[PDB]
Design a binder for this molecule. Structure first.
Ligand SMILES: */C(C)=C\C(=O)N1CC[C@@H](n2c(=O)n(-c3ccc(Oc4ccccc4)cc3)c3c(N)ncnc32)C1
Length: 271
C-alpha cells in the first residue's frame, strides 16, 4: 500500500502468536500475516546491524526464491527494532533437531538433509550469491522435516559484538578453509568447504566439528593439512563426498552442481 516499497511489510498486518527465543542476531517470534499466513518475525536489536546496507540487500534477497531456501518475505524498517519477516520453519534449528536422539534417524534421512541444503546452495551459486556463513546453526527444519538454508549473506551486515554474542566467537573458524583462515580469501569454494563441514555435522548427529579442539587449535590442525574424520553413520561413499569439499586447493573442490550429482548417486546406490 501507500508508503511501502515492494520489500516493505506493514507491521500492522502482523499478529504475534509465540516467542521462539533468541535467534541468530535477534529475538524471533511466530505469527501470522493478514490473519492467515504463517511467518517468522526476527527483531534486530539497535546497534547489532549495518541497517541501511542490510535494507538495500534485502531487495536482492526478496528475489531469491527456491524450495530449499528460507523465503524472505519483506522487512519492516519504519520503527526500531527493524523486523525481518520470513517463512516459518516449525521444527526450528537443524542442530537441535539432529541432537534429539528420539528421532532415531535413518541414514537415508540424513542424506536427504544434505541434499536439501545442496539444492539450496546450487541455487545460490547459480545466482553468484555466497552464503558466507553456512553451518548447521543456520539451517532450519519445517513441519515436513525439510531442511532449508537460512541467514544467507547476512553476516556481511552484522557489527562485531552481535556476531560474537550470537555465534560464540569473532569468527566461524570450524567451517572455514585454509585460504580464509590464512588470508581472508572468500569465494564459492569457501561455501563448498563449509558445506562439507555441514555434512559432517549432519552425519555426526550435531557434534561440534573438531569437538576436542579450540578454534585456535582447529586453525593449526587445518594448516597442517589435517581434517575431520569419518562419522560413524557415514558410508565410505558419503565420507568421500564430504572429504572432497576439503581439498587444500580451492580450485580442486567440487561445485554444488557436482555435489548434488554425487549425493543423488549415493541415494540411488544406498536405496
Ligand atoms: C536455529 C537454527 C536458530 C535459532 O536461533 N532459533 C531460535 C528461533 C528459531 N527461528 C529462527 O531463528 N528463524 C529465523 C531465521 C532467520 C530469519 O531471518 C532470515 C532468513 C533468511 C535470510 C536472512 C534472514 C528469520 C527467522 C526461524 C524461522 N524462520 N522459523 C522458525 N523458527 C525460527 C530458531
Amino acid at each position: 500500500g501507500l508508503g511501502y516499497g515492494s520489500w516493505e511489510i506493514d507491521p500492522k498486518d502482523l499478529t504475534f502468536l509465540k516467542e521462539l527465543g533468541t535467534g541468530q542476531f535477534g529475538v524471533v517470534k511466530y505469527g501470522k500475516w493478514r490473519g492467515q499466513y504463517d511467518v517468522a518475525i526476527k527483531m534486530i536489536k539497535e546497534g547489532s546491524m549495518s541497517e541501511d546496507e542490510f535494507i538495500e540487500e534485502a531487495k536482492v534477497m526478496m528475489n531469491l526464491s527456491h524450495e530449499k531456501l528460507v523465503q524472505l518475505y519483506g522487512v519492516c524498517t519504519k520503527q526500531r527494532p527493524i523486523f525481518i519477516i520470513t517463512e516459518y520453519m516449525a521444527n526450528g534449528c537443524l542442530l537441535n533437531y539432529l541432537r534429539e536422539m528420539r528421532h532415531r534417524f535413518q541414514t537415508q534421512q540424513l542424506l536427504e538433509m544434505c541434499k536439501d541444503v545442496c539444492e539450496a546452495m546450487e541455487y545460490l551459486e547459480s545466482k553468484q550469491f555466497l552464503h558466507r556463513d553456512l553451518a548447521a546453526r543456520n539451517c532450519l527444519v519445517n513441519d515436513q522435516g525439510v531442511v532449508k538454508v537460512s541467514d544467507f549473506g547476512l553476516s556481511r551486515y552484522v557489527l562485531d559484538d552481535e556476531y560474537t554474542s550470537s555465534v560464540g566467537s569473532k569468527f566461524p573458524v570450524r567451517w572455514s578453509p585454509p585460504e580464509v583462515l590464512m588470508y581472508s580469501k572468500f569465494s564459492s569454494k569457501s561455501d563448498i568447504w563449509a558445506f562439507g563441514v555441514l555434512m559432517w555435522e549432519i552425519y555426526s548427529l550435531g557434534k561440534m566439528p573438531y569437538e576436542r579442539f579450540t578454534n585456535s587449535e582447529t586453525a593449526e590442525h587445518i594448516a597442517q593439512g589435517l581434517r575431520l574424520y569419518r562419522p560413524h553413520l557415514a558410508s565410505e561413499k558419503v565420507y568421500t563426498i564430504m572429504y572432497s569439499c576439503w581439498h587444500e586447493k580451492a580450485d580442486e573442490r567440487p561445485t554444488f552442481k557436482i555435489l548434488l550429482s554425487n549425493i543423488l548417486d549415493v541415494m540411488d546406490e544406498e536405496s
